[PDB]
Design a protein around this ligand. Structure first.
Ligand SMILES: [Mg+2]
Ligand SMILES: [Zn+2]
Ligand SMILES: [Zn+2]
Ligand SMILES: [Zn+2]
Lengths: 40, 537, 67, 541, 83, 119, 97, 191
């Protein structure tokens, strides 16, 4: 793209905390399957 | 043309696109429609939402307000007029949206908070009830225990339930937190002003001392009732085990969680100027003084303050008196920070002489942490390390030597540490665009030109802290919008992955997008840990 | 003033009602809300003169025959 | 197979005015100028290529088709072009709006400095069902003066002064107006900074003092980014739509007009043609933005960045900155001198046969005109009861009756064909004099085909036109449809307008020589005879 | 949007000069598009001239919808209106 | 353009047959006058739908409809069997619902004998 | 009629007309388009001066009414014709079920 | 064969005023609702009747008469077609496609849920054994399983010249099915 400029880092690849995002997506799915959703 | 670099959300939506994207991934699409009108307009009633959505009716608006009240995302405010016709009013609640924002970082700290009983109870006892409190809102005990059948181990939840509300998070439900901040002060500003009879003027007002000091008095027990309270706690039945009252429902508190979250930035400052073991004993001395700390800014001066300079001067002086006069937080003695001899006292003296403003102000020998005199140093020590990490260390040396004096001139930077006109004046233009230079010219002409003028470089605060805060908020709003865009290529893959709970191209499709869906949360947690410092005073 | 002076056929779209060229919106690139109608040509020059600066004179449409 | 093709007759019901955002300019655009201003004249035709007025925009030539819409100079609507500005610059037309929105904000917190109950009564007073523009401007002045007479903010502890224009296009704030001794934490740091910078070097700031602080447009751009979406109702902005917000008024992207808006003038057919001035102005804008981008690439010496950017501000202010005349050009009209004729009726103007041969009338053939229009086509364009053009029912072309296609063409004559007949006797025609004062200056007459080439008319009808003949000219228009022709003769014709509406008196009646010819007949010394009276009765009818 | 019935009409029963020229131009534009006439005409042309003969005979098959400023349709057939 | 009721008035095939039969008598015939772009489907449907009636039926269709009141079914399959069934002994293995549950062989045999005596 | 005597001048044509195109036909332009674009005026087209620009018919004079043509139809032709459509298909669906 | 009731406005030109209103509206509806396949409703054939017509309005520019009617259209759309008495269209190295002849030819059945003892050979002659055959020029009986409408989505005007120098899409009404039931597949397999 138009930007390629020096190092916006604090974005590496080594997670070490994969279960934390599992807790994130588990909370997301439990709010997704709640009694109230108010979709569409 | 070919807008693929996401330019179409540049100049349409800061500071509300975050609030719309946090609720669109959690509460459907109809709640985003009303929360995009509560933020964009202000206070508006039910029918004012109906005549503004153009696509929902009273059957649709009132259905969604219950789902937003359950997650305390909408403040109630019932009011009336001078002629009558009492109606209902609604604000947008940012604390509930922050509860939806973190939502797993809450169950990150609450697991690593208990003692020796480790990895036999923090998998299904507490981790299944705390996420149910965060997800379903206000919960009681009797409606939760009906979900289990043949409750043999029915008192195992009670021991972890009395322990959790003993030191914080669990709290009595929002009988006060749905009422807004300003009307709680404005109704109190009037109901102790209209009962005073006619008397002497004495410089024609005088009650703008008396009554509002009275207001301050009965502000103090309004906030203090949602805290450690003996109405729900210390209930002792006869010939039985100690328990709390299970009848009333209870929710979580986002007031002790934030002061428990500030401790991580305090430890990150403690990695500087001292090693690891001494940082560990400062860590445990900080964790012992969590739940009694003065919190991030009280609602006393959040709104209603019309900038009375005597009151605004004396508010930061009486907070020092709150900090000095505690019911036990100042008692950071030897017998309190070694159990929960002289070597740790020497390390604590090194903490006193470390010269960052923590663990100072100690006359008799018992130490205290100055929370109020630390916050500019906390907000500035992490602000410098972001220009250094992203833009460059030379720009960090420059932006520090703008503040090393006040209003540095032209020919003073090039006298220090580097030559002239090579990248001194080049990184200034890379820092005016981030509200971190704030140029100010004075001419000698009569029409304020730029040729016959000189430049003055003063680092004006509270403009660099707010622009980076809005930048971090809009990066968070960017990160959740792209996540819900790649979900549209999985509506025919993840919904269809329910009838069984090999086509190896799906190994590069299903099990390839999963870590692509994980590494956005993996850095959203770091965005959260980097953004919090600009909203803790 | 219109028919025998500066009669001009144009297309304007329903959603975000600017004007394009006979089959396409140039802003809403899906381009199925295209409505073809007649307009004076000096109104077209006035619309492009207002749009050449930072003014958006958006046209809102409704049908003539309702009830 | 195919699909239902549905259509509805639609009409314009409003005009929602707004300003374009940064995305709306790039969206409707076709190409960027791409930091180019040389127009790319290679040695082929001295053509126009990418980075300038290109075929991706409109066209202004006979050749060199657009190829976005594959059309000539006559069939291109036009295409815009977005232009990216480095160091986004202040706007000239929204100057007073920027002052009125900047007076109402705290400059430290970037929020409105009004209280909460007074904000509530202004919000309750703005949402009335019947609000005029006068009432809305009154309430906005009522909130602006109440906001200017408050000196201290609410959400922060910063003092706030008066923001004005520099006593160009400079914005000037005044934090400190009076010499009050109130214990504020800011002026101590202020005076300490000033005595420090005067103790460090007394060469710079030891000539004058209190000039003011500066308002960078890049600073107030962020200050307009950081308010709220909700306070804009008190600022005049109606930002419930994303297309328009209180920082969309600063120049960040500039739309460049199509080449149809800026055509090549016809002082040419010579090579290396000349263009308009706006192309030169945006060329200079591209150059003075290229210099700013070059100054942003590598650091340069001195204050020429700020001076060059202020020149960019003055240039973009001059770009859109520097009359109720006639205007429209109407087909099927003529302008000829006038002549006296009282042998003509008062609802008739005699039209000569030289201008009643090019001024046609479109007639659709039907059951009741097929016998006449066949002979009318056969007579041709030179014989006066004839026709000049022909339009087929299925739209073959516009068949003119001059180049071939003789009397066999009148033999088919399908029932939807439209001929363009000559102006004949009895046709409704409207008739005008150019200094039109009141509504009796444009009447409507019947035609009558005559000799010598002048628009002669009666003199009972020349008084409402204010005709004093002496070689004066008058205009003549023919309506080209069946519905406007019925309105000229019914509620606009001469026989239905015998009174002026100013007083109800008759304005169109007998005139000069018709008075003294009536005083001499009805004089008492007039006695006639059947050798005279019979002739008098025969001359009048 | 509401339609006033025939017996609740409150406007004038006469034919305005503004609504005499629009009904005549509408009839003259219909006749030029090959509509059948309902009058004994002598052999001539100019549908505006043979629409005057229908208006003098009152055999025009139209009505005149008179709008009031809230929607008050009020049918007002042409043969009811007199000169 | 704009739909009002989509699933309205579920009608049979003989009704469409008699409607397109009485539609081509309003103007000139399709068979008698054989020796604008709408009559193509008009002469194609009346030719295609009458291919199973090879080697009157109005009152016979009324009689079969009144005969259909013997045993109860659901909504669609009674129409789906009244426009069908050349009636051998093996059609209700493919046509009728659930195919093996409620009915005996003799009752489907006698109703198919009624249909075979009809057609 | 607006509650105050304000006449016909540069500041006087802001009485009731929200018509931006009509008020653009006066001297000292380039200041009434920008507050219309700034304050986001609704501008419902109803006046004659912004119907001759857009090419609409004016609401006064001749276009103050409509002429519509009577179909001369009765309710006898507008009947839902029906013969043995649902005469039994609703009957053979409720027998003991 | 369903009877859908929709509503729209139509025009009658002034040269058709000699006829009555009903036949003129019926003539004007047939030029729009011929084999002109409706988006996601199916395909209309004729006009059954009409109801609640209104007064004929007219704009000054046209001079015609615009009437908004409400009519019942005979729409060809089976929801779950239990049998079809049509024959073939074409055989290729895919499933077989058939033609319900007289109206259209769009019915295709992909060989994924069909008879598992059948196979296609690239020698253009498909003979199968699990008895006799099913082949060209005979009425194939089958079931309707999946019906999904596609859209008539437009295309860019600068892309139109790329589709006119060198050089399709099936219509909106698209039927499918399968063949699993024993005996189903041919008329003369029985009797
Ligand atoms: Mg003269
Ligand atoms: Zn559009
Ligand atoms: Zn073009
Ligand atoms: Zn402020």
């Amino acid at each position: 793209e138009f930007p390629s400029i020096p190092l916006p880092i604090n974005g590496p690849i080594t997670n070490k905390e994969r279960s934390l995002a599992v807790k994130y997506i588990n909370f997301g799915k439990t709010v997704k399957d709640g009694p109230f959703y108010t979709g569409s | 043309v070919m807008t693929i670099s996401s330019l179409e959300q540049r100049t349409l939506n800061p500071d509300l696109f975050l609030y719309k994207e946090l609720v669109k991934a959690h509460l459907g699409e109809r709640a985003a429609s009303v929360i995009g009108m509560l933020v964009a307009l202000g206070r508006l009633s039910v029918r004012e939402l109906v005549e503004k959505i153009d696509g929902m009716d009273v059957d649709s608006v009132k259905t969604t307000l219950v789902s937003l009240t359950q997650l305390r995302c909408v403040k109630y405010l019932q009011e009336t007029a001078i002629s009558g016709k009492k109606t209902t009013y609604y604000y947008y609640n940012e604390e509930g949206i922050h509860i939806l924002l973190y939502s797993g970082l809450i169950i990150d700290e609450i697991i690593t908070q208990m003692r020796v009983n480790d990895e036999e109870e923090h998998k299904q006892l507490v981790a299944e009830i705390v996420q149910n409190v965060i997800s379903l809102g206000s919960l009681t005990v009797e409606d939760y225990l009906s979900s289990v059948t043949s409750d043999s181990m029915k008192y195992t939840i009670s021991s972890l339930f009395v322990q959790l509300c003993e030191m914080g998070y669990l709290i009595q439900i929002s009988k006060l937190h749905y009422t807004p901040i300003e009307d709680l002060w404005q109704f109190l500003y009037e109901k102790h002003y209209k009962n005073i009879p006619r008397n002497s003027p004495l410089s024609d007002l005088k009650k703008r001392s008396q009554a509002k000091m009275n207001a301050k008095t009965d502000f103090a027990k309004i906030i203090n009732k949602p805290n450690e309270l003996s109405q729900i706690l210390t209930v002792d039945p006869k010939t039985s085990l100690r328990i709390v009252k299970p009848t009333v429902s209870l929710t979580i508190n986002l007031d002790r969680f934030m002061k428990g979250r500030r401790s991580k930035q305090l430890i990150n400052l403690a990695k500087t100027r001292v090693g690891s073991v001494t940082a560990q004993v400062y860590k445990i001395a900080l964790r012992l003084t969590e739940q009694k700390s003065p919190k991030i800014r009280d609602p006393l001066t959040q709104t209603g303050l019309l900038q009375d300079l005597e009151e605004a001067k004396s508010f930061q002086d009486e907070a020092e008196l709150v900090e000095e006069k505690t019911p036990g937080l100042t008692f950071n003695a030897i017998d309190l920070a070694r159990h929960l001899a002289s070597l740790i006292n020497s390390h604590l003296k090194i903490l006193a002489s470390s010269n960052f403003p923590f663990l100072n102000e100690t006359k008799p020998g018992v130490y205290y942490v100055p929370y109020s005199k630390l916050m500019p140093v906390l907000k500035s020590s992490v602000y410098e390390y972001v220009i250094a990490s992203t833009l460059g260390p030379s720009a960090m040396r420059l932006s520090r030597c703008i503040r090393d004096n006040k209003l540095v001139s032209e020919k003073i930077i090039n006298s220090t540490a580097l030559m002239k006109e090579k990248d001194i004046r080049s990184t200034l233009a890379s820092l005016i665009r981030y509200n971190s230079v704030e140029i100010q010219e004075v001419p000698r002409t009569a029409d304020r030109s730029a040729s016959r003028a000189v430049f003055l470089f003063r680092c004006k605060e509270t403009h660099s802290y707010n622009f980076m805060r809005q930048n971090l908020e809009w990066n968070m709003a960017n990160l959740l919008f792209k996540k819900e865009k790649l979900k549209q290529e999985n509506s025919t893959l993840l919904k269809k992955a329910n009838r069984d709970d090999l086509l190896p191209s799906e190994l590069n499709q299903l099990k390839m997008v999963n870590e692509r869906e994980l590494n956005v949360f993996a850095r959203l947690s770091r965005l959260l840990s980097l953004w919090e410092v600009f909203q803790m005073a | 003033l219109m028919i025998s002076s500066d009669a001009f056929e144009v297309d304007v779209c329903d959603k975000c009602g600017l004007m394009g060229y006979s089959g396409w919106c140039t802003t809403c690139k899906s381009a199925e809300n295209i409505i073809k109608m007649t307009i004076p040509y000096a109104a077209k020059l006035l619309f492009q003169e207002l749009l050449s600066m930072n003014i958006a004179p958006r046209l809102r449409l409704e049908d003539i025959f309702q009830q | 197979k195919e699909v239902v093709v549905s259509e509805t007759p639609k009409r314009i019901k409003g005009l929602e005015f707004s300003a374009l955002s940064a995305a709306d300019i790039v969206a409707q655009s076709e190409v960027e100028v791409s930091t180019r201003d040389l127009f790319d004249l290679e040695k082929d035709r001295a053509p126009k290529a990418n980075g300038a007025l290109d075929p991706k925009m409109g066209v202004s030539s006979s050749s060199l088709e657009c190829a976005t819409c594959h059309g000539n100079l006559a069939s291109c609507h036009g295409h815009f072009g977005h232009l990216k500005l480095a160091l986004p610059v202040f706007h000239i037309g929204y100057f007073k709006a920027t002052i009125q929105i900047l007076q109402g904000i705290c400059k430290n917190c970037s929020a409105i400095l009004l209280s909460e109950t007074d904000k509530r009564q202004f919000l309750h007073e703005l949402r009335r069902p019947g609000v005029d523009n006068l009432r809305r401007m009154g309430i906005l002045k009522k909130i602006l003066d109440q906001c200017k007479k408050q000196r201290r903010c609410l959400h922060c502890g910063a003092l706030n002064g008066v923001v004005k224009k520099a006593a160009a296009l400079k914005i000037i704030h005044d934090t400190f107006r009076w010499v009050g001794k109130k214990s504020a934490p800011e002026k101590d740091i202020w005076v300490g900074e000033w005595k420090e910078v005067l103790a460090h070097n007394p060469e710079l700031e030891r000539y004058v003092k209190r000039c003011m602080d500066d308002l960078n447009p890049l600073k107030t751009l962020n200050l307009f980014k950081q308010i709220k979406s909700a306070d804009c109702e008190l600022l005049g902005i109606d930002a419930t739509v994303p297309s328009g917000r209180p920082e969309t008024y600063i120049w960040r992207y500039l739309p460049a007009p199509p080449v149809c808006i800026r055509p090549s003038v016809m002082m040419q057919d010579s090579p290396a043609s000349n263009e308009d001035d706006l192309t030169v102005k945006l060329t200079e804008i591209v150059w003075t933005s290229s210099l700013i981008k070059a100054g942003l690439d590598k650091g340069i010496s001195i204050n020429n960045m700020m001076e060059h950017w202020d020149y960019l501000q003055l240039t973009v202010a001059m770009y859109i900155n520097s009359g109720n005349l006639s205007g429209k050009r109407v087909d099927f009209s003529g302008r000829t001198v006038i002549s006296p004729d009282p042998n003509l009726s008062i609802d008739e103007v005699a039209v000569p046969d030289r201008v009643a041969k090019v001024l046609t009338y479109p007639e659709k053939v039907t059951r009741y005109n097929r016998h006449k229009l066949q002979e009318l086509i056969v007579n041709g364009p030179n014989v006066h009861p004839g026709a000049n053009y022909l339009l087929k029912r299925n739209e073959d072309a516009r068949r003119n009756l001059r180049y071939g296609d003789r009397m066999k063409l009148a033999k088919n004559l399908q029932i939807g064909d439209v001929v363009e007949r000559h102006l004949e006797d009895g046709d409704v025609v409207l008739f005008n004099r150019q200094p039109s004062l009141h509504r009796l200056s444009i009447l409507s007459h019947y035609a009558k085909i005559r000799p010598w080439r002048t628009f002669r008319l009666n003199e009972c009808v020349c008084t409402p036109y204010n005709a004093d003949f002496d070689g004066d000219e008058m205009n003549l228009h023919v309506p080209q449809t069946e519905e406007a022709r019925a309105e000229a003769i019914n509620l606009m014709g001469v026989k239905n307008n015998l009174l002026t509406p100013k007083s109800g008196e008759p304005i169109i009646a007998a005139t000069q020589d018709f008075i003294t010819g009536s005083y001499l007949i009805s004089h008492k010394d007039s006695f006639y005879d059947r050798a005279t009276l019979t002739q008098l009765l025969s001359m009048m009818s | 949007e509401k339609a006033i019935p025939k017996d609740q009409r409150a406007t004038t029963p006469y034919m305005t000069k503004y609504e005499r020229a629009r009904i005549l131009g509408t009839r003259a534009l219909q006749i030029s598009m090959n509509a059948p006439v309902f009058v004994d005409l002598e052999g001539e042309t100019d549908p505006l001239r043979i629409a005057m003969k229908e208006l003098a005979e009152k055999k025009i098959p139209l009505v005149i919808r008179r709008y009031l400023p809230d929607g008050s349709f009020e049918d007002w057939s042409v043969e009811e209106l007199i000169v | 353009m704009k739909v009002l009721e989509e699933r309205n008035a579920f009608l049979s095939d003989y009704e469409v047959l008699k409607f397109l039969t009485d539609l081509e008598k309003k103007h000139l015939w399709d068979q008698k006058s054989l020796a604008p772009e709408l009559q193509g489907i008009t002469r194609n449907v009346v030719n295609y739908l009458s291919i199973n009636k090879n080697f009157m039926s109005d009152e016979s269709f009324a009689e079969l409809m009144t005969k259909l009141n013997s045993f109860k079914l659901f909504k669609a399959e009674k129409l789906q069997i009244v426009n069908q069934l050349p009636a051998n002994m093996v059609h209700l293995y493919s046509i009728v619902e659930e195919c093996d549950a409620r009915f005996d062989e003799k009752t489907i045999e006698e109703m198919l004998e009624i249909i075979s005596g009809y057609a | 009629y607006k509650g105050e005597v304000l006449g016909i001048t540069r500041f006087g044509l802001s009485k009731m007309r929200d018509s931006v195109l009509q008020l653009a036909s006066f001297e000292k332009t380039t200041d009434h388009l920008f507050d219309a674009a700034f304050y986001m005026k609704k501008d419902a087209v109803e006046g004659v001066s912004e119907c001759i620009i857009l090419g609409q018919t004016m609401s006064i004079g001749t276009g103050s009414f409509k002429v519509v043509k009577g179909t001369n139809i009765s309710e006898k032709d507008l009947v839902p014709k029906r013969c043995l459509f649902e005469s039994l298909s609703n009957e053979a669906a409720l027998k003991a079920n | 064969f369903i009877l859908s009731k929709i509503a729209d406005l139509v025009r009658i030109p002034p040269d058709q005023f000699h006829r009555d209103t009903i036949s003129a509206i019926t003539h004007q509806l047939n030029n729009k609702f011929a084999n002109k396949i409706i988006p996601n409703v199916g395909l209309c054939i004729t006009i059954y009747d009409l109801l609640t017509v209104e007064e004929g309005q007219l704009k000054p520019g046209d001079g015609s008469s615009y009437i908004n009617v409400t009519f019942r259209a005979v729409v060809f759309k089976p929801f779950l077609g239990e049998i079809v008495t049509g024959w073939i269209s074409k055989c290729t190295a895919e499933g077989i496609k058939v033609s319900l002849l007289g109206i259209f030819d769009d019915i295709f059945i992909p060989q994924n849920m069909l008879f598992e003892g059948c196979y296609y050979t690239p020698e253009e002659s498909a003979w199968i054994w699990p008895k006799l055959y099913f082949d060209v020029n005979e009425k194939i009986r089958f079931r309707i399983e999946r019906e999904v409408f596609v859209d008539v989505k437009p295309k860019s005007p600068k892309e139109r010249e790329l589709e006119e120098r060198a050089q399709e899409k099936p219509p909106a009404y698209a039927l499918l099915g399968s063949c699993q039931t024993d005996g189903m597949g041919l008329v003369s397999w029985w009797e």
